[PDB]
Design a protein around this nucleic acid. Structure first.
Lengths: 475, 317, 430, 86, 53, 40, 49, 62, 98
RNA sequence: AAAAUUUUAGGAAUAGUUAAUAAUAAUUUAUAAUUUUGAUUAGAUUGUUUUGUUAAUGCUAUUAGAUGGGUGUGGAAAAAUAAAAAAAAUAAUUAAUAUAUAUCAAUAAUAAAUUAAAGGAUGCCAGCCGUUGCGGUAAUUUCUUAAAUA
């Protein structure tokens, strides 16, 4: 029994309103009970919490419990990028023993907050991998006799970095430079392998900064790249670099249509919207691997959805509709019209809400989703998804009343900002961890695939053999 | 990490030897020199005495900077340090990487450190200045005073490297506070030596014979100082026998004045026509009087004879 | 609120003007909807909208990290914008999760304050009636979920009162009406420091009459009279707040007598002989300014014939300008606040010291500072979203107390500037 | 042997196990804390009215000055005393 | 610990080395540690038997 | 409790304990030296 | 002025010693409570039916 | 450093040298500003080294 | 608020409590009984050069009504109230106690 | 296993029932068993020479616990939470630690614990009389150890 102070009145029995553990699990990406009835092509945001994400939960995030045939989605994980120390064997002491280093994912954030009491001070990159980026950028920054065009051609780009061999790389670079020729100052992005300058021998090949970017929840085996020839060390780690071609400062510049009445004072006086740089008047895709982008700055990625994934989702959703719908729902004005909530009506409302979410997230056009990526994040892009990239420069504050009259441009109060042809310089805006293509389940494999059978083990066998074996656990 | 030493003067070779010895092949070592034969000799000696990590020898700042992560300069003069850091075509800070670290141990002016840190920040690198105080034998044995000024996280990153050749390492603040700490320490040393000279001369004037006891009395009382504790045993004989020439010492009047020569440049203004520096200026007067008397390289204990001259300039100016 | 589906994104598919939540969409999906600007309201369950509210606020905070003052302000703007899109039907009682008279089971924060039996029996109806006093069914077709939550919490205050534990003992409770900002844990700390200061400094200073200005909740007035002052007047611009403060002063017993609350702007009435409320020159005038994000940030000059500063600087200037006309010659004005202005916006000059040195109208008799202890929301607007201050910002936040006298009583206070360890200004030494 | 183990006070070989001499404390600030040498089971019994097997003694962990200094002073009899009954 | 302190004079004060006899405690000595030998550049310990008694 | 020194046989398994619990023959020998000192 | 100085000193030491005393005062409380009450689990059990 | 809640490896800059680490007692260890668990872990590792047991234990974090 | 406070509730002892106010006679009681419901045809504010000019146009006004309206309008101009506060003030109605 | 000590302003019936039995696992036999000496049910309800009070064998107060459907495992269910009783290698053993400092994170002081001694109240009135909204009026009076008590 527990002590309780006596009282001559009635005792109140509070039942409480805690934060739902299910919601916390869903946002953390570690919910193994949720079944999404309809598969969609829309980015999924998850916030890593104290390294609770792992290969086990990420496998389900890739292949949801509803029964999927492919990772047909973009997966943004705020934070969650890990950094792995090198490993070495202690021979001293009682005997030989490995020391593996470790992953400082949650322990070391990407950017520390700079609050000061007494042009403000902010961090725009990840401090842990600032120095590893330093070497990659210095490899190109040299102004020597050998032009950096050939360096980027050979060393930097692989066989295929963007939309359609050794000659192929040179013609690709030629097209890019010719396109960039007409502008006094332009830039473009590419995927490039690590330079030899960033690999020091130890025979252990280490990185320049002593730290390798990694995601502890990566499933499958990393992409292997050949120099037959040997494997390129740290070939799965790649860099998406921006090449140019030829402490932020704040500054303050000098109706509500959704309401019925007229508001004595507006409910939301001000807006705020991210400021992105101008794109010169090309996208890039990887058709051979599954990509994990780890931004080193604040990027805006516009992802173009492949027609293959779009058709897959549409056809599978319609198959579910015809299998489960009875066609008794009739035809209400809008799906959420009062009436007997048949299973068919519930399911139709579910699909309608899903379509509304997809069209709202996508911009006005095929389909393109705008994604704000930050340092510390990790964005998983499956195979075949296209995307263009820009850099975000800050934020604005827009008078709602003024923007109702003339425009957001004129309606500005305060803006916070952060700051053929030839290649003048190179930056690295992201590290791409490329992994060997994940399996695409055949129709029978998808039919017999059950999320429960992968709640403890079988993840690595699934990802190695390729999809789940039919007859996995029965006969 | 890859740590490379460039200074290689007289006080820089011990830093390279200590880094090579205590590296234990845990960090790579680099050595740069103006002439390759000298650095070859240094590497040969270090390997003969025991080398745990392979050592590379550099003639050019371009290779030096584009290879190593940490650069350590231990040079002789401000002009040499400026040559190494900024004004050279292959200047270290000009061609510095976005993340590499550069540390300077030579005693340069606060403004010199200002330009160095500003340019390093422009290029994205981190520069923190750590002037050193001690003897070359103190460096051999691994005892030194480093007063580093720069970024706190970079300083924390640099702790382990410093301890390989330094005992007392402190963080004086941001934006090159190490040079100010060294400068103020020298000024205070000079002032205390002057005051000790005054006290012993006054004791002799009063006619107290046993100085052995008076030394302990002063050391146990207030106003005690290591400068007194050092110069007393010599000053006692030097005042009772003013004829004998003060002996030569490694630490000299010329060295103190050279190291004080940065104070005027580091102070804001001298046009006020007044001295907001009574004691410090009085000590400087006597030090300069001793230097101009042909006693520049002799011991710091020679201020006794020229303190009286330390009044002529005060009266006339 | 009443919606107008014409200005909605997809009126043909959602003629009601919003997208009902069947209780299945993931909170990231609902968040994407709200970001695109659609309105979302629960279908048949309050739990769905509560989950969406919590998840959307967490996700937006994840998107816009509080790495500095500028992104904190931007986060607050964006988070207000989104949180003003999470509706609940004005007739919340129709939701099936609102009440269950047979299992005495419900959902929502009402059971963090009321017991399940009392709520499911009698208090659901009383809350239904309490809501209409502020949000008529005739006028409002829908309601914001933040408005619903604040209505529940203000109903808790109306029923069983609140409690200012560190300022006032366990036995004194207040009933601040809906819409009058209550006092959070962080907001008390400046008042705790002020209370200690007054406890120590009522003796040496002949401090008899106190005037608290903008004493919204009344906590400052109650703390002043508790630490001891025979006469306490409070001036608040809210008639409902003064009504409730006077009722609570009656309620708290005889220990709070001669506390008088009047409705007015920053300062009381100026009458000086027609009714002569004045001639009551006060020994101490207490100001505890509100510090919200917009008030602290958007501050500058406005007006051409009556130029005036806006925001925190404007309020401080008005206080400094209008004080003294109500102050005794040997009286001292106290301003208890936090350094949140100098945290949110360090680029511009510190207002209090700017006034004290540039303006040469007041003299710093004392300044006290104490690090912020607890955590919680700061200067919270009643019907706005909650935003608890993150750890890194809290580490810099401090509670300040500035005690100032007039330059005319410089001779009177001269001997107090002369104690060792004081900091006399340039004017006193002359 | 519990489905969910007492995570903070695990033991060996189950309850009530062998008798043990422990130095039991009191739920008091250290400023007055004193111990008692008691014999009890390995798994502390907080169910029966009999908490312990035998009370061996008490220990005062706060030194006390020698009140007995004048009585036949022996070598170093003025050092502080630590009192114990056994 | 003088009894003239009203907090030491109280019956329930622990600033004593006894109980029921008196209050406080007159001037007494205690020896602290000075673990700073190693801060010195050369620290040595010389083992020699007592000679002064 | 049982000490798991960094240099005994590691179990290269990702479905359980990462270090086995076996030990090098030197650890067997030194453990006796501790056992004997305890036996006296 | 002496009374003012005494009050100033009292308030200054209060501001300085507020932090350490709360840690000491808090610790004395956690050393005197036999079993702390899990109000979270009590409320969850009350909700359960 | 073996335990996820005893990050001894985060306080390499909290001590000046080997002897400074080995001579500082629990009180000075707390004064330098170290959590309770990290403080106890450092103290126990130092005492084990003193007794002859070097810090040779398997990192259980993974 | 009085109506809610009158509606049924439970005592501190668990007893049932119902004040008379939450009853049909005292429940459906309109606010006012006196003729304080007046019309103001025009009520506008115009900014002259250095002056605000408030025009009232009505067939009849209550005592000090113009000056109290001006007071609350000045409060609004300084930015001290909101729509909720205006509605609460308007619903408060006549206050017979000076 | 047993003996023995309970409460209610309107005081009555109780039962998977008592004993016997070659009956584990009762197809049997009997005039069975509880209760006005206060039962059963319902209401209150852990017990509790430790509390408080008094001249008082009076009055009064209380928190040690326990727990037939959640695994039949285990010597024993006491098993969904754990100020820690050190748990199979001396982890550590002159330290005030029994830390919060296991420091961030949706969340609210509703709630859970604990007694230091390092100026308010408060109106009234026909103006020859329409909803003009003037005045009298800066309206005047009541408000500035006890209750419960052994």
């Amino acid at each position: 029994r527990m002590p309780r102070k006596p009282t001559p009145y009635v005792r109140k029995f509070l039942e409480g309103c805690p934060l739902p553990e299910t919601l916390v699990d869903d946002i953390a990406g570690a919910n193994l009970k949720s079944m999404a009835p309809f598969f969609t092509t829309a980015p999924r945001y998850i916030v890593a919490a104290e390294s609770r994400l792992s290969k086990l939960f990420f496998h389900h995030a890739l292949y949801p419990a509803g029964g999927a045939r492919r990772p047909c989605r973009v997966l943004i994980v705020r934070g969650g990028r890990s950094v792995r120390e090198p490993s070495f064997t202690i021979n001293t002491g009682g005997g030989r023993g490995e020391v593996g280093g470790g992953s400082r994912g949650y322990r070391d954030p990407a950017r520390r907050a700079y609050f000061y009491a007494r042009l403000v001070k902010r961090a725009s990159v990840d401090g842990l991998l600032s120095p590893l980026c330093g070497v990659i950028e210095a490899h190109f920054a040299v102004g020597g006799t050998c032009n950096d065009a050939v360096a980027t051609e050979g060393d930097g780009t692989e066989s295929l970095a963007k939309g359609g061999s050794n000659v192929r790389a040179a013609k690709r670079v030629a097209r890019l430079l010719h396109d960039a020729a007409h502008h006094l100052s332009s830039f473009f992005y590419v995927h490039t392998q690590l330079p030899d300058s960033a690999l020091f021998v130890s025979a252990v090949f280490r990185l320049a900064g002593g730290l390798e970017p990694t995601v502890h929840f990566a499933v499958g085996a990393p992409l292997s790249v050949l120099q037959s020839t040997t494997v390129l060390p740290f070939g799965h780690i790649q860099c998406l670099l921006r090449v140019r071609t030829r402490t932020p400062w704040c500054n303050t510049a000098g109706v509500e249509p959704w309401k019925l009445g007229v508001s004595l004072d507006p409910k939301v006086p001000f807006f705020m919207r991210t400021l992105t740089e101008k794109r010169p008047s090309q996208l890039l895709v990887r058709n051979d691997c599954e990509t994990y982008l780890l931004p080193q700055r604040e990027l805006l990625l516009s992802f173009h959805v492949p027609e293959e994934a779009e058709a897959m989702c549409k056809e599978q959703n319609e198959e579910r509709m015809r299998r489960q719908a009875a066609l008794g729902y009739g035809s209400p004005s809008h799906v959420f019209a009062e009436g007997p909530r048949t299973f068919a009506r519930v399911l139709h409302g579910m699909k309608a809400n899903l379509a509304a979410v997809e069209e709202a997230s996508s911009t006005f056009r095929s389909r393109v989703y705008e994604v704000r990526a930050l340092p510390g994040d990790v964005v998983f892009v499956p195979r075949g998804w296209k995307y263009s990239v820009e850099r975000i420069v800050g934020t604005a504050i827009i008078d709602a009343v003024a923007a109702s009259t003339a425009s957001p441009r004129e309606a500005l109060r305060a803006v916070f900002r952060t700051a053929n042809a030839e290649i003048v310089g190179v930056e690295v805006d992201a590290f791409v961890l490329c992994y060997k293509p994940y399996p695409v389940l055949s129709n029978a494999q998808a039919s017999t695939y059950v999320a429960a059978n992968y709640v403890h083990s079988g993840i690595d066998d699934f990802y190695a053999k390729g999809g789940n074996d039919v007859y996995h656990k029965y006969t | 990490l890859n740590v490379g030493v460039v200074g290689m003067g007289n006080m820089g070779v011990p830093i390279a030897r200590n880094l090579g010895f205590k590296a234990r092949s845990a960090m790579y070592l680099q050595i740069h020199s103006r002439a390759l034969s000298k650095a070859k000799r240094v590497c040969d000696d270090l390997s003969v005495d025991g080398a745990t990590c392979a050592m590379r020898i550099h003639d050019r700042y371009s290779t030096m900077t584009k290879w190593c992560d940490v650069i350590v300069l231990a040079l002789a003069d401000v002009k040499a340090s400026r040559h190494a850091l900024l004004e050279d075509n292959e200047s270290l800070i000009m061609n510095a990487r976005k993340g590499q670290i550069i540390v300077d141990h030579t005693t340069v002016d606060a403004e010199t450190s200002r330009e160095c840190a500003h340019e390093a920040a422009r290029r994205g690198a981190y520069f923190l200045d750590a002037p050193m105080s001690g003897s070359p034998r103190a460096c051999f044995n691994g005892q030194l005073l480093l007063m580093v000024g720069g970024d706190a996280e970079t300083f924390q990153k640099m702790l382990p490297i410093f301890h390989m050749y330094a005992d007392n390492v402190f963080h004086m603040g941001e934006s090159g506070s190490g040079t100010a700490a060294k400068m103020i320490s020298q000024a205070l040393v000079a002032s205390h030596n002057a005051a000790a000279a005054e006290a012993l001369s006054m004791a002799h004037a009063l006619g107290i014979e046993d100085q052995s006891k008076l030394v302990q009395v002063l050391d146990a009382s207030w106003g005690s100082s290591t400068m007194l504790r050092r110069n007393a045993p010599l000053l006692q004989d030097l005042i009772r026998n003013p004829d004998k020439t003060p002996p030569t010492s490694a630490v000299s009047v010329d060295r103190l004045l050279s190291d004080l020569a940065h104070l005027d440049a580091s102070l804001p203004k001298r046009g006020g026509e007044d001295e907001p520096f009574p004691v410090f200026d009085a000590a400087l007067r006597s030090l300069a009087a001793a230097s101009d008397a042909g006693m520049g390289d002799r011991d710091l204990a020679s201020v006794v004879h020229y303190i009286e001259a330390g009044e002529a300039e005060l009266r006339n100016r | 609120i009443t919606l107008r589906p014409d200005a909605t994104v997809d009126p043909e598919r959602y003629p009601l003007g919003y997208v009902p939540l069947d209780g299945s969409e993931s909170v990231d999906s609902v968040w994407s909807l709200v970001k695109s600007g659609a309105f979302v309201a629960p279908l048949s369950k309050i739990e769905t909208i509560h989950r969406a509210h919590v998840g959307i606020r967490y996700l937006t905070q994840s998107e816009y990290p509080a790495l500095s003052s500028i992104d904190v302000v931007g986060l607050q703007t964006r988070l207000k914008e989104l949180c003003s899109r999470l509706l609940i039907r004005r007739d919340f009682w129709v939701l099936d999760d609102y009440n269950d008279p047979e299992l005495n089971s419900s959902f929502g924060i009402q059971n963090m304050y009321f017991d399940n039996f009392k709520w499911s029996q009698v208090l659901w109806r009383r809350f239904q009636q309490y809501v209409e006093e502020y949000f008529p069914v005739a006028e409002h077709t829908h309601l914001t979920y933040d408005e619903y939550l604040q209505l529940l919490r203000s109903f808790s205050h109306f029923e069983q009162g609140a409690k200012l534990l560190p300022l006032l003992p366990k036995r004194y409770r207040i009933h601040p009406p809906f819409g009058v900002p209550a006092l959070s844990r962080i907001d008390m700390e400046p008042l705790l420091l002020y209370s200690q200061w007054l406890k120590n400094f009522r003796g040496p200073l002949k401090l008899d009459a106190a005037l608290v200005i903008r004493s919204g909740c009344g906590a400052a007035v109650f703390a002043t009279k508790l630490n001891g002052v025979p006469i306490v007047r409070g001036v608040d611009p809210n008639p409902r707040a003064v009504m409730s403060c006077r009722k609570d002063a009656q309620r708290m017993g005889r220990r709070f007598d001669s506390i008088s609350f009047r409705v007015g702007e920053m300062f009381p009435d100026k009458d000086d002989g027609n009714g002569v409320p004045n001639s009551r020159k006060y020994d101490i005038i207490v100001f505890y300014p509100d510090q919200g994000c917009y008030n602290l940030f958007f501050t500058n000059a406005i007006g051409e014939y009556a130029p005036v500063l806006t925001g925190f600087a404007g309020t401080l200037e008005h206080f400094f300008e209008e004080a003294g006309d109500y102050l005794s010659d040997s009286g001292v004005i106290v301003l208890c606040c936090t350094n949140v202005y100098s945290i949110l916006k360090p680029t511009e000059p510190h207002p209090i010291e700017y006034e004290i040195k540039v303006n040469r109208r007041w003299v710093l008799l004392d300044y006290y500072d104490m690090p912020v202890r607890g955590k919680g929301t700061l200067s919270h607007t009643p019907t706005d979203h909650h935003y608890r201050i993150p750890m890194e910002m809290r580490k810099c936040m401090r509670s300040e107390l500035w005690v100032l006298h007039k330059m005319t009583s410089i001779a009177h206070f001269a001997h107090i500037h002369n104690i060792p360890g004081a900091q006399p200004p340039s004017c006193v030494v002359s | 042997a519990r489905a969910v183990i007492k995570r903070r006070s695990p033991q060996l070989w189950g309850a009530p196990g062998a008798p043990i001499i422990r130095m039991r404390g009191h739920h008091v600030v250290w400023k007055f804390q004193s111990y008692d040498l008691v014999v009890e089971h390995t798994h502390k019994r907080r169910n029966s009215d009999i908490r312990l097997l035998h009370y061996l003694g008490k220990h005062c962990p706060h030194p006390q000055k020698s009140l007995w200094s004048p009585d036949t002073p022996v070598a170093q009899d003025r050092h502080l005393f630590m009192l114990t009954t056994v | 610990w003088s009894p003239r302190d009203p907090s030491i004079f109280h019956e329930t004060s622990t600033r004593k080395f006894q109980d029921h006899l008196y209050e406080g405690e007159p001037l007494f000595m205690q020896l602290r540690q000075c673990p700073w030998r190693t801060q010195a550049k050369v620290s040595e310990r010389w083992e020699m038997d007592e000679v002064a008694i | 409790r049982q000490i798991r020194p960094y240099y005994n046989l590691p179990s290269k398994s990702e479905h359980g304990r990462k270090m086995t619990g076996f030990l090098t023959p030197y650890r067997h020998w030194m453990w006796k030296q501790n056992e004997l000192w305890r036996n006296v | 002025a002496d009374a003012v100085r005494r009050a100033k000193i009292r308030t200054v030491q209060h501001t300085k010693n507020a932090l350490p005393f709360a840690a000491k005062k808090r610790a004395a409380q956690r050393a005197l409570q036999v079993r702390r009450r899990n109000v979270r689990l009590e409320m969850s059990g009350n909700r359960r039916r | 450093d073996i335990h996820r809640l005893r990050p001894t490896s985060d306080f390499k800059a909290s001590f000046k040298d080997w002897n400074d680490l080995f001579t500082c007692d629990k009180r000075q260890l707390r004064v330098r500003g170290i959590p309770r668990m990290t403080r106890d872990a450092i103290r126990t590792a130092v005492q084990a080294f003193q007794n002859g047991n070097p810090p040779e234990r398997f990192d259980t974090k993974e | 608020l009085d109506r809610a406070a009158a509606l049924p509730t439970f005592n501190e002892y668990g007893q049932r409590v119902v004040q008379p106010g939450a009853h049909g006679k005292e429940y459906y009681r309109v606010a006012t009984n006196l003729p304080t419901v007046r019309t103001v045809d025009r009520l506008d504010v115009v900014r002259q050069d250095d002056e605000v000019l408030i025009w009232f146009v009505g067939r009849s006004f209550l005592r000090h009504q113009i000056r109290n309206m001006v007071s609350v309008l000045k409060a609004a101009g300084h930015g001290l109230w909101n729509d909720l506060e205006l509605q609460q003030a308007l619903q408060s109605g006549f206050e017979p106690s000076r």
